[PDB]
Ligand SMILES: *[C@@H]1O[C@H](CO)[C@@H](O)[C@H](O)[C@H]1NC(C)=O
């Protein structure tokens with residue numbers, strides 16, 4: 001969609017199959033000199049930067065610290081873990097000791 | 098009180114008995130060069 | 146494949162709409178694109194002339210080369226102390242390279258390049274919203290002494306870095322009206338200094354040719370219905386909307402764009418430590434900040450307001 | 451004379467280390483023709499009558 | 502943020518330039534009739550009024566997109582990986598589950 005996020009897409013930065021719909025329009029030249037007059041919608045990346053809101057490092061519930069490479073949420077409590085432990089018999093001592 | 102009127106007081110302008118309670122905090126120096134880092138509450142006289 | 150010899154590349158005359166006389170204009174310095182995506186306010190300016198290179202293209206600091214204002218288009222040197230950059234006040238020039246400049250500028254609304262010579266006072270200007278940019282969560286005019294040293298991204302001052310590549314093609318025809326003269330209703334072709342001239346007239350038929358000598362080729366009626374240009378021009382130029390391509394418009398070379406965004410540690414201000422007064426199920430922060438400072442609060446429960 | 455926008459007009463003569471300058475109040479703002487604001491006139495356009 | 506590079510326009514004089522489709526990002530080729538090209542130094546071709554100008558406009562990534570780029574991901578499901586410090590009988594154990 002032009003004028004919005006995702007207007008230009010590619011599988012990688014160094015990829016060659018770049019696809020885009022930037023709503024670019026070519027106009028007939030008016031002055032005698034040479035130029036290519038083009039009217040284009042603004043960058044949807046810039047519009048999304050200007051209207052990003054707040055990221056999840058500042059709005060994630062339960063106090064989850066969002067980290068990247070890899071994408072993960074660290075150090076937050078949201079429930080209960082039932083842990084079953086097989087404690088070895090060498091740890092225990094007899095009641096007489 | 099800091100940040101409001103009466104933050105620094107004295108009986109007279111030339112008196113050495115001057116009292117103040119501005120929130121001045123000395124910070125730990127981080128860069129290599131010699132200085133003082135300090136953060137102060139804004140003077141309450143200009144706020145008034 | 147990306148060569149940096151610069152002995153096989155040439156600048157060009159650009160069409161930009163504001164010289165000194167405030168009109169659409171031809172300039173040897175034409176700003177093509179401006180990339181203000183740094184974090185120290187430094188900008189990268191793509192000017193249609195080479196920089197740091199001599200007459201023949203050998204690396205020569207404090208000289209630059211451009212296309213002159215004459216019929217014999219000789220690539221002409223000038224000294225780089227005459228170069229000036231401004232947005233609202235003067236800019237500090239930080240780096241120079243062929244087709245590319247790195248300059249630190251104050252905030253403004255238009256980027257201007259100028260040659261401050263005794264006679265040649267050519268200038269050019271593009272529209273660019275150069276704004277005050279800060280990293281972190283507290284605004285600042287300039288970075289302070291005390292800081293946090295967070296990661297930011299800065300244009301590298303060295304010319305050896307590369308942020309990509311730009312395509313360079315061989316130039317096309319560039320016709321002259323000074324190479325055609327109408328005498329007694331007939332056309333003459335006038336080559337200066339005996340240089341070879343390729344001509345094309347179509348008042349009787351698609352009559353091409355090459356001469357270094359004055360010629361009544363078909364006689365014809367007016368010089369306005371024919372052309373004649375130079376042939377000995379195989380010097381690569383970066384493709385621009387103010388030029389005409391040659392018929393084999395394929396990528397003849399690739400040229401490095403300098404001043405890559407290097408990640409760099411850089412300081413940000415530390416705001417005044419808040420005074421927190423505690424009252425039952427709530428707190429009150431007494432916040433003093435000379436510059437705008439971001440406060441972000443969230444509850445650690447199911448609903449993070 | 452063509453001037454940037456400002457709040458005053460100033461004339462000076464840099465003669466004998468004395469400017470002999472004069473300043474007057476004037477509301478000078480960047481005025482534009484037509485219905486689209488522009489810092490400087492562009493290449494492509496409609497060629498509207500102005501004065 | 503894209504670059505929207507516009508190359509040098511193609512001119513043919515008393516001849517047509519029906520444009521060829523290309524695989525570049527957001528390709529836009531469009532033909533102009535009745536054009537008179539003019540760079541500095543004079544009118545740039547012979548043909549009086551019947552000229553064709555092929556104007557080309559595709560789009561490309563900016564050179565500084567290797568840093569300021571946004572990557573889009575799908576999130577299906579997330580599983581915890583907790584580090585547990587369990588001590589028992591004056592014996593410690595730090596382990597990830
Ligand atoms: C976009 O950025 C401008 C910069 O001044 C800001 O005023 C504006 O609120 C932002 N958002 C929108 C939706 O225009």
Ligand SMILES: *[C@@H]1O[C@H](CO)[C@@H](O)[C@H](O)[C@H]1NC(C)=O
Pocket residue numbers: 339340341357377
């Ligand atoms: C012009 O062309 C002739 C033959 O085509 C050649 O001998 C001569 O060197 C050329 N001169 C220039 C200046 O290119």
